[PDB]
Structure formats: structure tokens, C-alpha cells
Design an enzyme around this catalytic site. Sequence first.
Site, PDB file in Angstrom:
ATOM      1  N   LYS A   1      45.241 133.118 134.426  1.00  0.00           N
ATOM      2  CA  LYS A   1      45.003 134.100 133.507  1.00  0.00           C
ATOM      3  C   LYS A   1      44.445 135.277 134.445  1.00  0.00           C
ATOM      4  O   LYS A   1      44.025 135.110 135.504  1.00  0.00           O
ATOM      5  CB  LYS A   1      43.493 133.943 132.718  1.00  0.00           C
ATOM      6  CG  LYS A   1      43.846 132.815 131.847  1.00  0.00           C
ATOM      7  CD  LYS A   1      44.708 133.070 130.691  1.00  0.00           C
ATOM      8  CE  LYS A   1      44.893 131.870 129.681  1.00  0.00           C
ATOM      9  NZ  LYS A   1      46.074 132.161 128.475  1.00  0.00           N
TER      10      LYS A   1
ATOM     11  N   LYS B   1      49.154 126.106 135.401  1.00  0.00           N
ATOM     12  CA  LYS B   1      50.949 126.510 134.849  1.00  0.00           C
ATOM     13  C   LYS B   1      50.748 128.133 134.838  1.00  0.00           C
ATOM     14  O   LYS B   1      49.881 128.589 134.717  1.00  0.00           O
ATOM     15  CB  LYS B   1      50.948 125.749 133.458  1.00  0.00           C
ATOM     16  CG  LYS B   1      49.800 126.007 132.480  1.00  0.00           C
ATOM     17  CD  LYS B   1      50.060 125.195 131.219  1.00  0.00           C
ATOM     18  CE  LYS B   1      51.307 125.787 130.581  1.00  0.00           C
ATOM     19  NZ  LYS B   1      51.043 127.061 129.924  1.00  0.00           N
TER      20      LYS B   1
ATOM     21  N   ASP C   1      51.618 130.710 132.296  1.00  0.00           N
ATOM     22  CA  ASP C   1      51.369 130.856 130.990  1.00  0.00           C
ATOM     23  C   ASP C   1      52.726 131.123 130.380  1.00  0.00           C
ATOM     24  O   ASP C   1      53.737 131.195 130.877  1.00  0.00           O
ATOM     25  CB  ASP C   1      50.411 132.100 130.663  1.00  0.00           C
ATOM     26  CG  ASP C   1      49.696 131.925 129.572  1.00  0.00           C
ATOM     27  OD1 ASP C   1      49.938 131.121 128.435  1.00  0.00           O
ATOM     28  OD2 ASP C   1      48.783 132.681 129.134  1.00  0.00           O
ATOM     29  N   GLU C   2      52.939 130.786 129.026  1.00  0.00           N
ATOM     30  CA  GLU C   2      54.312 130.638 128.343  1.00  0.00           C
ATOM     31  C   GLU C   2      55.008 132.195 128.363  1.00  0.00           C
ATOM     32  O   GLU C   2      56.424 131.972 128.431  1.00  0.00           O
ATOM     33  CB  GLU C   2      54.185 130.278 126.824  1.00  0.00           C
ATOM     34  CG  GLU C   2      53.672 131.370 125.760  1.00  0.00           C
ATOM     35  CD  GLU C   2      52.120 131.153 125.844  1.00  0.00           C
ATOM     36  OE1 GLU C   2      51.493 130.494 125.923  1.00  0.00           O
ATOM     37  OE2 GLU C   2      51.518 132.396 125.302  1.00  0.00           O
TER      38      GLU C   2
ATOM     39  N   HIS D   1      56.516 124.146 125.704  1.00  0.00           N
ATOM     40  CA  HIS D   1      55.666 125.148 124.845  1.00  0.00           C
ATOM     41  C   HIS D   1      56.322 125.270 123.609  1.00  0.00           C
ATOM     42  O   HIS D   1      57.228 125.386 123.365  1.00  0.00           O
ATOM     43  CB  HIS D   1      55.586 126.289 125.471  1.00  0.00           C
ATOM     44  CG  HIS D   1      54.387 126.575 126.479  1.00  0.00           C
ATOM     45  ND1 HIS D   1      53.092 126.716 125.923  1.00  0.00           N
ATOM     46  CD2 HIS D   1      54.275 126.548 127.620  1.00  0.00           C
ATOM     47  CE1 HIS D   1      52.199 126.672 126.727  1.00  0.00           C
ATOM     48  NE2 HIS D   1      52.846 126.875 127.966  1.00  0.00           N
TER      49      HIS D   1
ATOM     50  N   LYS E   1      40.813 127.042 119.435  1.00  0.00           N
ATOM     51  CA  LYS E   1      40.956 128.540 118.512  1.00  0.00           C
ATOM     52  C   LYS E   1      42.108 128.675 117.726  1.00  0.00           C
ATOM     53  O   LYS E   1      42.194 129.494 116.962  1.00  0.00           O
ATOM     54  CB  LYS E   1      40.957 129.476 119.679  1.00  0.00           C
ATOM     55  CG  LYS E   1      42.155 129.599 120.517  1.00  0.00           C
ATOM     56  CD  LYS E   1      42.326 130.697 121.670  1.00  0.00           C
ATOM     57  CE  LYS E   1      43.555 130.415 122.316  1.00  0.00           C
ATOM     58  NZ  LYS E   1      43.675 131.068 123.910  1.00  0.00           N
TER      59      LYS E   1
HETATM   60  O1  LIG Z   1      49.033 124.965 122.593  1.00  0.00           O
HETATM   61  P1  LIG Z   1      49.257 125.702 121.597  1.00  0.00           P
HETATM   62  O2  LIG Z   1      48.670 125.256 120.226  1.00  0.00           O
HETATM   63  O3  LIG Z   1      50.907 125.897 121.594  1.00  0.00           O
HETATM   64  O4  LIG Z   1      48.949 127.199 121.971  1.00  0.00           O
HETATM   65  C1  LIG Z   1      49.116 127.839 123.005  1.00  0.00           C
HETATM   66  C2  LIG Z   1      47.914 127.980 123.887  1.00  0.00           C
HETATM   67  O5  LIG Z   1      47.705 126.747 124.281  1.00  0.00           O
HETATM   68  C3  LIG Z   1      48.159 129.046 124.858  1.00  0.00           C
HETATM   69  O6  LIG Z   1      48.973 128.589 125.969  1.00  0.00           O
HETATM   70  C4  LIG Z   1      47.184 129.788 125.476  1.00  0.00           C
HETATM   71  O7  LIG Z   1      47.756 130.696 126.603  1.00  0.00           O
HETATM   72  O8  LIG Z   1      46.495 130.702 124.547  1.00  0.00           O
HETATM   73  C5  LIG Z   1      46.198 128.696 126.065  1.00  0.00           C
HETATM   74  O9  LIG Z   1      45.029 129.373 126.984  1.00  0.00           O
HETATM   75  P2  LIG Z   1      43.572 129.143 127.049  1.00  0.00           P
HETATM   76  O10 LIG Z   1      43.695 127.697 127.991  1.00  0.00           O
HETATM   77  O11 LIG Z   1      42.888 130.068 128.196  1.00  0.00           O
HETATM   78  O12 LIG Z   1      42.946 128.980 125.838  1.00  0.00           O
END
Ligand SMILES: O=P(O)(O)OC[C@@H](O)[C@H](O)C(O)(O)COP(=O)(O)O
Lengths: 123, 123, 467, 467, 316, 151
Positions: free
Chosen positions: E16, E42, E44-45, E135, E175
Site C-alpha cells: 500500500k 502482492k 494490488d489488483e 482476483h 470490511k
Molecule cells: O478479497 P475481495 O473480497 O475480492 O476484495 C479485495 C480486497 O481484498 C482488496 O484487494 C484490498 O486491496 O482492498 C485488500 O487490502 P487490505 O488487505 O489492506 O484490506
Amino acid sequence: MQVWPILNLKKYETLSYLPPLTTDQLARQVDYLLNNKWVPCLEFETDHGFVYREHHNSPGYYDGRYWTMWKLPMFGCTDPAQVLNELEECKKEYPNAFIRIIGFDSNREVQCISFIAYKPAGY
Amino acid sequence: MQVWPILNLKKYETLSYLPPLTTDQLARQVDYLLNNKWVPCLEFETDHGFVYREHHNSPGYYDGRYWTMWKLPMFGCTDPAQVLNELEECKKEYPNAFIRIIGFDSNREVQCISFIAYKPAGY
Amino acid sequence: ASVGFKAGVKDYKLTYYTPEYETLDTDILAAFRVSPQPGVPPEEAGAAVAAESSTGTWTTVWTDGLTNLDRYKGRCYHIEPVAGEENQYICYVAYPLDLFEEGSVTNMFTSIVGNVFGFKALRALRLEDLRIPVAYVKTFQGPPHGIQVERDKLNKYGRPLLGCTIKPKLGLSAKNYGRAVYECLRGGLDFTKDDENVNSQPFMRWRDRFLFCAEALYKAQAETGEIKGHYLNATAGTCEDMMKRAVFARELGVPIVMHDYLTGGFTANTTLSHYCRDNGLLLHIHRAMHAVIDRQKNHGMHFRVLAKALRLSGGDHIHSGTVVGKLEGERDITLGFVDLLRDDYTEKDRSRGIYFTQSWVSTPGVLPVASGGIHVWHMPALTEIFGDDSVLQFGGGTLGHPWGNAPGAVANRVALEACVQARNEGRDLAREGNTIIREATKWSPELAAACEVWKEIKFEFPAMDTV
Amino acid sequence: ASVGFKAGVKDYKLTYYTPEYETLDTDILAAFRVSPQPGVPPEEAGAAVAAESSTGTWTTVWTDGLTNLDRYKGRCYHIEPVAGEENQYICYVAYPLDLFEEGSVTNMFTSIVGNVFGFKALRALRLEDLRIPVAYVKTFQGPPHGIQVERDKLNKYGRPLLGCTIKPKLGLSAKNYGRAVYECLRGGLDFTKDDENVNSQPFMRWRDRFLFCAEALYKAQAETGEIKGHYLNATAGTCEDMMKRAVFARELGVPIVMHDYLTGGFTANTTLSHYCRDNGLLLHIHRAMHAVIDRQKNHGMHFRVLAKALRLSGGDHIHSGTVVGKLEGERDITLGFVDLLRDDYTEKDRSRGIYFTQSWVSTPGVLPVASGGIHVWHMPALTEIFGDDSVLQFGGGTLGHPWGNAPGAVANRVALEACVQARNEGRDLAREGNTIIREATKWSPELAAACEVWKEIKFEFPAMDTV
Amino acid sequence: DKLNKYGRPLLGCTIKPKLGLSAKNYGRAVYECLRGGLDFTKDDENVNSQPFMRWRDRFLFCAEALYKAQAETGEIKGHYLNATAGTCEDMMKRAVFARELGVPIVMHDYLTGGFTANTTLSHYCRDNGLLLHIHRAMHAVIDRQKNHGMHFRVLAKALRLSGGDHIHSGTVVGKLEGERDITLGFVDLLRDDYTEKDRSRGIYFTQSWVSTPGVLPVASGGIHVWHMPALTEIFGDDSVLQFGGGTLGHPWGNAPGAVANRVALEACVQARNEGRDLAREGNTIIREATKWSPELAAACEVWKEIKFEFPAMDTV
Amino acid sequence: ASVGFKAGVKDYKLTYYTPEYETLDTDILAAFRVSPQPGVPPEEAGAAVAAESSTGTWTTVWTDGLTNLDRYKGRCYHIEPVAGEENQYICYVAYPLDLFEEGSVTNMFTSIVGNVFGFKALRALRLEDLRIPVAYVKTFQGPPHGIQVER
Ligand SMILES: O=P(O)(O)OC[C@@H](O)[C@H](O)C(O)(O)COP(=O)(O)O
Ligand SMILES: O=P(O)(O)OC[C@@H](O)[C@H](O)C(O)(O)COP(=O)(O)O
Ligand SMILES: O=P(O)(O)OC[C@@H](O)[C@H](O)C(O)(O)COP(=O)(O)O
């Protein structure tokens, strides 16, 4: 703010980030192994305790993953003492080796357990 | 006509061709770093003090460029004493490491400063 | 609505002088310094430049009616007389975005600079600047890497980079070239380079050179512990040969190649730049032949236009002059295009010859290279004019040192770190320049000997190209 | 024998002014028009040009001793003051054959024209001519086909070839471009062409243009019974894109492609020329951007040098000016480089600006193309200045005819055959020019209407580039 | 078998901020997370190739960083390099450089990239020994509401067929939406060879896979050390638990942040293996570990009060 | 200048709700129809959409300081309530040009529509429109031919 160490901090996969296992703790993991009906087996290595790349660099290839087998997988074993017994016999024959206990799930043919049980001094 | 030496003449980038920095000189570079509003940070390395090529030979790839971070970048730092303080703490914890001070320009995301601040004996 | 077609020639000003036009943010704007022939008025001279560089010809053609010329025509929208000159004006022309092929510096120049400089009705013509709209800038790859990435790959921060051109230009054999390279590199210089005209010749074939230079650079790197590089020249006669050379440089694992963009061409340069981006090679650019086009103030194209064209086509370094050396380059105009090469935004500023505000939408910056007749005593001026983000090259200044290449390199590396330390400490390089160098001579026998040799060399002549 | 090495800067004249030198038949010779700064003497100015364009630098380097500089150094062997000018000389420089890469016009220019024009010690510098030795000429392919082969393939003999540039330059769609092409071709013109800046743009993408122009050219050919051609522009941003376009032209079976050699570059041009030789395509060359370099008499490179460079790199046609049209071009100097382009041997002749005798060892000749502001009344002058071996192009002169393209083409084809018949009959085109055209208007309503439109158009201004 | 990892979930971490870091800074953050005990880091997407960081520079610096952490720790490390791109051609270019670097895993956004491009990459990965992480970016635009769309279990089945070695499957406790029963339902459809009809979990039909390999579910999104017992309990050993903010948000930096997550997880694995009930003794296990792990301790302080509890939109 | 780093989670609105922002001509703008869960205010709902679709995460990370987040962050710059609906708003978000890969519709969607529709704190979310800046439009080829050429 503590700085995470850099030297002499090799690790050994599952459970190596926890404080050293007392013999009760060790015995408890072997019980877990047997209670799930997985086959135990011991492996030892004296030369390359860690993964490395000498013969190839293509994706997924690493040297040092295969260790050598101590005797044979203990099929039908049901007494954790039997396992801990072999550990002692192996230790005395190979005091200079890293030794680990693994457990097979023949149904999925995957190792469902693997943890270091003995390390040479200096480690 | 003097012949430029060949043995034991490793260098360490910016400022290493000048006579060793006295502590006043060192303090002055940290002031320059802070006056420009760049973030200081310290890095140390015990194993590979110099660049080498072990895992790849394609253009632009070298091993040994990344050192390990001492704590965290000192965001908001404004007192050079704070920086020199960390240097001392790092030195005492890693007397056997090369340690360097770098300074980030978050706007351009480029390190605008980088110089060796401590070297192990023998070097 | 389709006004009729009436054959015949009419004044260009009727269609191409449009003083009321408000320029669009997608327009390519041009500032031309026009000198009309007696009897040809500014408006017509300017309209004629705008006409032939975009959509019109010398007589009315019926086909104009099949399109909407109002949207494609280039147009002279402003004329400003040149102070102190008689019959000379700066005409501003706007060209709509639809006239250019995306990503082709070759096409941009073919329209704006293709035929207008040869009109019988003009005495001289000079392109001073171009405002390249951000919508057109995004269709280009730009530098293969740029300043930030280059420093990150080489692990070099906090001071200008030092390089050296092997001499004599032509004539050395491949083994001798590598011998001279190893010695310069082990003394502290970051790079050595083929001179611009060293390609492949009877005295030294390219593949033998690339091979010996790789052995030499790897030896100096192992000895010093600092990453070294040697620019291998890929300039060649055909695109095919150019790629062959780039491919062997990739196979050797060296970090940087070089190209003469103007003698090689924009079409070949864009191909190499893309190849370099794809293969991790840094690209050094030479401006050989530029002064044939940009020296005189009354006719040609100024270097700032050729510098913008290179940042678009692609290059990680570009020669930008020394100001104080053997080749022309005024300080203010130089600082002006150095900003256009490195920064993301440069505001209009006629005192430096920048006619339009230019934005780069994050196209990476190009490292300017000062090279040509410079020596240790020039070090403070160079560090002061250019700053940390530059490459300072010393060819004769290294191979001319009395003790050889290694000591010659140490001299330049010590002189530079002395200036960087002094500057960083608060000293004024402009005023304390010679004191800083003189102080260093007290503990650097290598610097000392070089100081003796070039103490009296300066290059001071009136400049031809001034604001 | 290895005289010692002594660091320090010394005059270039000590090593590079060699007035006693006898030039070798393998030497590349250069004639530079030098304007030194006050206080810099001719010999040093010339020696400095010879030095930096070959083997030397600004200060003594020890490496010169590892080679035999006497055999590689370029040398100023003769200086001649310019009549009527003050402080201007013609310095002759000889460069040994070993300094150049075989078959690379890019390398020849990088040495001879790379950095010397920017020396602080010179005010202006101009390259007037080059004597390319036959041993170097043989390392080049030269034109893909040349005059003889081209006439043989197209089956056209006995008269200049007629062509026409579609207008407006930019803005027409692909179907409209083909419509205008079919109409011009069916009227008697041999070729139509993309304008130099038509590559691939939002208003008309290249592949759609190539496709529609092929349908149009094939239709006009079937209607008339004469072989037709349309120059498809392959100029592009990268070597890759340029080749893509050439490849589709080959797939369509058309006879001719086109390239802007100076904006595209010599490296890309040599690649296309070789491809054209290998695939039977005629190559038309545009000199877009040449006047930025060759207009002024005091600084730059004359067109004859750029014309020689093209005959070596490769092209079957090259724009060479009109003399009488809208763009600069004096008669004598033009006839001078037209001979250098078409003939096998041209003897030194200062009255035409030819400084050296040039031999071509059978490198095929290039067809000169007169284009730019010409019309039917210029036909006799054009046929007289150029002769049968030329291509005369009329863009506005065809699309500006009051009755459209077909009648516009007939006008030009009739005016030309009238001049050819008259000349062949013994008439003097210079004196009977207007009578011949006027006589033709009596039986050609098409010619007649064109005569009315352009009767008063002439382009007469003083020239900037004179002998 | 290839990574030599058995007996516990795999740990990963997303670098991040999502966008904005340069290539050298990305690699610096990667080396620090990996040396602390995480198995993977990784892209990020949405990190593909952008003005701030071009793909080839990223792949190159991340390889140097991952190889350094691997040499320091002695455990095989991996960094998912994103091959998602605009054309099939560009996607293959990126996969090919990952193969040339010898790294073990690449990544693809199967729904924004597409099934046609995903099947091509999956075949390429089988042929070249690369593990493929998937993803589900854009899935909630289709599967959130109970009255219109396609449920995630259908999109999960489609991925196991097209191809992927990992697939994001939600966290339940984090979340982003994800109910426990419905989640356990499609997690079974992803990992097992046979799953019987069971409407209580939203499984309408019995499904057999005739030995098509199983996909590893990845829990990621707003999770932290206190969630560790719930995660180990809901998913079991065969899963990858990812902590982006949960590692880079630790007060002492990345390495200590990684140690925190690795210690919290091994503590739960040991406790579970010993017979303890992660559901009831969850907080006791974590609290006990804080007594000997200063790293875990500091993380516990920071996130003690963070929970994400809202009514769910998609229910059985 | 590098304000310190302080671990911990804080409201998205502190960094991502920027009602005073003037959009740039190079910004990709988005109009989202947001339906927040009870207890989650519009500003935070919108800020959360702008945050996860660009540069931020659920808790403060130290790396933000290595860059200039002000220039990369997406931001909710305007909120307008939906007429006749209760608890539904149209939140406008601006994303800087540097966040997108040139010529990749796949990348544009992965950021703007990747994860935000699944936030526990929202009930429903709908993307209604996007303003694609001309500087980004030029990085695409567009139709292979188009209406005129086809006819
Ligand atoms: O896994 P999904 O429900 O597809 O959702 C996608 C999330 O995982 C997404 O890759 C993220 O970047 O918000 C996680 O970050 P963080 O680890 O800092 O929360
Ligand atoms: O930099 P430009 O103005 O393009 O000019 C070109 C010069 O730099 C040229 O490369 C050089 O060979 O003459 C420099 O040699 P030296 O270092 O011995 O002076
Ligand atoms: O031939 P050069 O001197 O290179 O000059 C170039 C010109 O020939 C140019 O191609 C033209 O488009 O202006 C001719 O059009 P038109 O036929 O309508 O005059």
C-alpha cells in the site's frame, strides 16, 4: 520500536516462529497427527538445511526440498511413543542433522503436518 | 607519477573519495538533508556490502542494492541530533555492519541523499 | 454552406490569418521568427507559413469543399514585431490535434517544418518553440526509464554522474578500447562511452568492441564496488543493424546503449527507445548534427524544440551543452531547455526563450549531459549550473591527465565530491569555486597534477544564438 | 617513434593543417565554407574542423600513441579565401577511408557534420560538397531501381513523367482521396501521390487510404491502357510501422511507395530502400525539412550534399525543386545537382557549385522531381531545364483547374506532349515557349481553360543561395 | 508441494498505497514484509503499468527483493506479479518476463480481464510452472443483491474451470460483505471433489469435479491479528490469509508487522492442534502470545477495537 | 512536510472528502448513486468509495509518506441528494490521470469498479456515468473503422 534481526535468523516453516517446543508440546503435535489418522514419518538432512538453487532456475524449481527418509512411513502406528522413540534413535545416529516429523494424508496425498523436531547446535 | 591502487580500495558512492568525514562534517550533511525537507532514514547490511550478481544477469539487475531498514523513515524529524542519535544506537547494535543515511524527497520519490556513515573494521 | 468554388489564386491571409482565434488546449502551437522579403507583409508571410504547413496550397482547389477546412486548417493567430530588428516578427501558429499521427515525432515535423522554410517569399525562418498539448503527449512512450528509475537501477544518488569519452575518436583497436575503459572506470568515473562516430569500422568492428568493453567494465566494477556502465553505440546504417547491436548489448547484460538520434533519425530512434523500455536498457542520446540546424538566430530550429522532440521519441540522457566549454551554449537559454527536459511543468518565460507553458503529464524526465572541452577547474560552475541531476563528461579531461586514465578519473571524481560537499555545507560555488578546488589539491596528488595542466584553459567567445 | 606524451592543450594546426598533403583516391574530401570569429586564423579554424570531425580533441591525450594517427587523422589540406567576402574561406578537408562504416550514410554524417558547426571559435560553417570515393560508393546499394529500370517497368519512354499531389494536404477522407485519384489518373497523368504529411491520422487511416487508392488506380489503368501508379506513403513513427505499410503495398501489387528521408531518417530510409529492391517497389523520396538546413549561404549543408547522400542510401525519385515555382532554386546550381543525381560522372565546375569531380561506378541514377507552384505556362521551361528524365508534378495545378481533375490532367498532359513534339521538331522552347502553348489552346478546350486561370502567375524573388 | 509449505494457512500481504509508489519503493516494502515471516506479498489488483511505476521496473525490483528475503529466512517466498493488461499480447509479455525471472507466481483479474484472456494465461501457467492467483475485482457489481445478478458461487465454479490456483473468497469478518454459511458453501465447491446439495448453504445442486484440482481460497480485506482465530477456524489450513493494511499499518514497520501476523497464526495453529477451541478461546490465545511477542503486542494495541458489523444484503 | 506517521484507523472523510476541489481537465470523473447503511453518513460513504478505488486502505499505513498522496488520491468532491429517495445520494469522484494504464479499459474498471460495490457499509451502489478526459481518450485506438469508413 524494535528492529527485526537480520543475522542468524533462519526459520523452519510451521511453528518455528513460536518459542521452542517443550517435550509436552512436541508430544501433543504427534497426538494431533495420529488422532487425524495421518501416517507419521521422519526426515533428516545434514548437508543443505535450507532451500537453494543450484541445478535450475525455472519457475517452481528449488534444490533442498527433499530430505532423506528415516526408515519408512509408520503405517498403522497409533502410539505417539513409537514416533518419539524413532526421533530419539535418529537423533543419536545423526546428532548433526536437522530432523523433522511429517504426516501423510493418503486420501488426498498431501502432507498435512510438517515441523522441525531437532536442530544441530549452532542453530 | 603515482599508480592508483588496486587492492582493498572498495568505494561507497557519494563522498567516499573524500577524506573521512569528521563528526562535524557528518552533522553538516544531515543538516543539509533536513534543511531541504527530505526525510532521513538509516539502512544497514552485514552480509553483502557490495553489489553482485547471483540471481540474474539481464540488463539493470544486480543483487545487493537493497540493504535492511533501521526502524522507519523519520517523518517529521527536524532535529539532526535525532538522526545522529539513531546512528549511534544502530552502530552499537550492529557494530559489524555498514550503515548509511539516505533522505527521501517524497514529492519526486527519489533519494536525494545517500552516504556511508559507518564501516566495520577492516574496511 | 458550400460557398461556390472559384478557381484562381488568392491571398493566404484571407483564410489563414485569424487574429481573433482563441487557442484550444488540444492545439499544437508554434512560435516562428519570420523575416519576410521586401514587399511581403507580416500577415501574409505568417498566413503562408500556416497554410503550407497544414492544409493549403498556392491556388484554390475544389476539394476543400468536401471537408470542413475550418476545423483542420492551421492558423496564424498572433504576430508580434521583434524588438530592435527591422522586418522580423514572431508569428504564432496553431495546428489542430487531428493533423498529427499519434506517437510519431516524424509526422509532427513533416507538417510544421516540412516546406515553409524554403518559400521564395521569406528571407529566413526559425522555429523557436512548440507547445505540445497534453492530449498529444500521452500518445508517446517518452523516455525508456527517466531520471528516477535510472538512479534507482544504478544505485546512484546525491551528486551528478561522471562519464568519459574514449579518445582518439577513431583509430583505436577493440582490445585497446577496453584497456582504456577499464582504467577510467576503476578510478571513480561512473561511465565511459563510445564517441558518437564509433560504430563499426575497419579499425575496430562493433562486436569485438562490445565484447572487450564488457570484460573491462565488469573488471572495474568488481574492483571498486560501484555499478559501472559503458555506453555501447547502436547507431548503424539500417534498422536491422541497429537492432542487432542492441540485442548483443542485452545478451551481455550491460546497462546502457547509445544512439545518435538526428543522424540515425526519429523513426529509428523511436524503435530503439521502445526496445530499450522492453529490455531494461538505459538509452543515452547524442545530438550529433544539431548545430547545423540550431546555431544561427535567423534561420533553423532552436535546440529547445529538438530537446522536446527527443523527450517524446525517447531517451534517458541527452547532450545539452556545457555553457563554459568548447561548444556554444548560453547560460540562460540553456537553463531554459534543461528545465523543459527534466521537469513536469515549465511556465512561459521569454527571458529564457521559453515561449509557451509546457506540461508533461508525468512523462519521465531526461538527464542532461554536459560534455565538450571541460576540465577540473570547471567543476564548480558545472555543479552550480546543472545541479545533481546531470551527467558531466570528460574525454580529453581524463585521457589528457599526465598520469594516465585511472589517476585522471580520480581527479574528476575528487573535484566533484569536493564541490558537492562544499555546496551541501553552505558554501557558494560561484564565489568559492577556485578555493574549493585549490583546497582539494592539498590532499589529492591526482587532482593537483590535473590542476597544473589546465589552469589557463578557458573558452570565451561571443555567442551567435542569444535570447 | 613514440615521441613522448606531454599533457596540455596545443594548437590544432600543429597536427591537422597539412597543406602539403596529396589526397588519395580513397579519401572522402570535404569543402567547408568557414567564417571564423575575430582573432581565430583560417588555418586554425580549418584545422579545428578537421580535428573534431575525425580523431582529435581539445587537449593532448596519451592514447594517440597506441595507434598511428598519421593514417587516421582528417586533415585540412588547402584553404582558399572567398572572393568579395571578408573573413570567409573555403577549407578543404580529407578523411581517410578507414573512418567510415561501409554502407552507412548515418556514419558518414556523424563524423563530418557531427559537432564542428557548433564550435565557439567559428561564426558560421557550411558544407558545400563531398567527394565520395569510388571504393566507398561500392559499399552502398544505391537506388532500388534507377531511371533505366523504372522506365522499363512502367513502359514509359520519350517524355518527362507527369504526377499530381492530392489536395487539401490533410483533411480528406479515404474514399474521397481515392475519388480524386481516379479522376486525375484517367485524364492522362502517370502518377498521383499522398502529400508528404499524409501518414495515418484521425481523418484518414493509412490502410483505408491504401485500399481505396488501389481500387482507383486500377480503374484508371483499365480505362486508359497506360500503366498508372499512386505513391503510397510509408513514412511512420517506428521502423516497424514503416515496414507494415510497405508490406501492404506489396500485397496490393501497386508499383510505388514513398518516404520522407530526412524526417524519417537515414537509418529508416536505408531499410526501406533495401526492402524495395527485394520486393520490386519503386521508391519516391521527399526532402521535407531540407530548407531548414540548406537555405542560407553562410551556415548549413547545401542540397547537393543531401542529394548525394540519398543516391547512396537509396531512392528512385527525389524532389529537386522547380527553379520557376514557389520554392527557392536557382537554375545553374540546380542543373548542377541534377547532374550529380542522374549521371555516372560529373566533372568539377565551380560555376555550378560543384567543387569536386564525382564518379558513381554505375550506381543507378535518380529521377529528379520538379514540384511546387508550377502550372501549364511553365511547361516549356520545365521541359527545357530538366529534359526527358524527370517527373513534373502539379498539385494545385491539376486540382485547381476549373472543370475538375480529369480535365485538369488532360491540360497538363497536352501541354507537355505539345512541348515534346515542338522540341523534337527543332523549335526552341525558350523562345517559342508561349507560342507552343498558345497554339495548343486552339485544339484543346481543356488546356485553354487552364491557360486563362494562370496566365498571370509567376514567382520571382531574389535568391538566398547563390554560387 | 512446490513451495514446501504444509500444516497451516499461507500468509500474504498487499503493498500500500494501492497506486502511487515507485518501483524501487515497491521492492523495498516487499523485502521488509517477506523477511518478517509472510509467505507472499502482492501487487494490488489495479497495479498494472502506469506513469508512476511501469511494470517491467516493478517485476525486476520485486525479484531482487523477494530473493533477498528468501536468502535471509530460509523459507520459499513469492510475490504475485500482476499480468492483467489491456490486450492478450501485453498480458503474455508480462507472464513471459515472470517466467524469465524464475519467480513462482503471477496474478490476473479474471472478470475485468475476461474469461477468454484468463483461459489463455491459465494454460500458459500450466505449461510454464507458474502458480496463478486470481482476483475477483468487479464481482460485487454482479453478485451483491439478492434479487438480480449472479451469485458468487457460480462465478467461483466458472473460475475453477477456466483456471486459477488461488481465488479471493471474502473474509466474513472483514470490511467487505460475506456471510459465514454461504461462504463455507462456495469454499467447499472450490476445494473439494464432491459437494452435496444443501440449501442451508445455498448449494442447489450436487456437484462432482472428477479430480479437477482444488483452488485455494484467499481471505483478504480489512482483517487484523484479532481476527486470526476466527479466520483459522472458518477456513482451516487450506487458505491464504492476506493482510495489507494489517501489515503496513503496524506501528514499527513491515518486518515487525509481518512477525505479528505470523506469530498470531502459528499461535492459533498450535492451540487448535492442542485441542483448544478457537471460537471460545480466540482472544485468550492471542492475549497469551502478546506476553512473549513484543511485535504481536504492539499490533494488538492498535486494532483492539476494530470490527466491521453491518446487516448483510445477500442471505440464504 | 512529512507529518508524522500514527498507526490506527481514521475516517475516510478526513482525506478523501474534498468538497472544495476544482476538477482538472485530465481527471477521470465518476458519478456514483450511493445508498449508505443506516448510521453511515453520505460524506463517509462517498469518501470510502473514493478511497478504496484509488489509493487508500482501512487503516493508516506508513508508506503514504514515501509519495505525494495529494496528487494520486481519488476524491469525493461533491454530493447531491437524490430527489424522492431517502438515504440515496449521487457522489461525484475525481481520479487523477496518473492512476490509469494507457489504452486499457481493463485497468480503468479494475480501479473504479473493483471493490467498492461490496463494502459492508453500503447497501447498494451504482455507477451512472464517467467523464473520460480527452488526454486519456487518445491513448486508445477506438473503433477499427467507424460509421463513415464502414458506409
Ligand atoms: O478479497 P475481495 O473480497 O475480492 O476484495 C479485495 C480486497 O481484498 C482488496 O484487494 C484490498 O486491496 O482492498 C485488500 O487490502 P487490505 O488487505 O489492506 O484490506
Ligand atoms: O555535447 P555536444 O554539445 O553534443 O557535443 C559533442 C561533444 O560532447 C563530443 O562528444 C566530444 O567528443 O567532442 C566530446 O569530447 P571531449 O570530452 O574530449 O571534449
Ligand atoms: O519539391 P520540394 O521543393 O521538396 O517541395 C515540396 C512541394 O513540392 C510540396 O510537396 C507541395 O505539397 O507543396 C507541392 O504541392 P503543389 O503541387 O500543389 O504545389
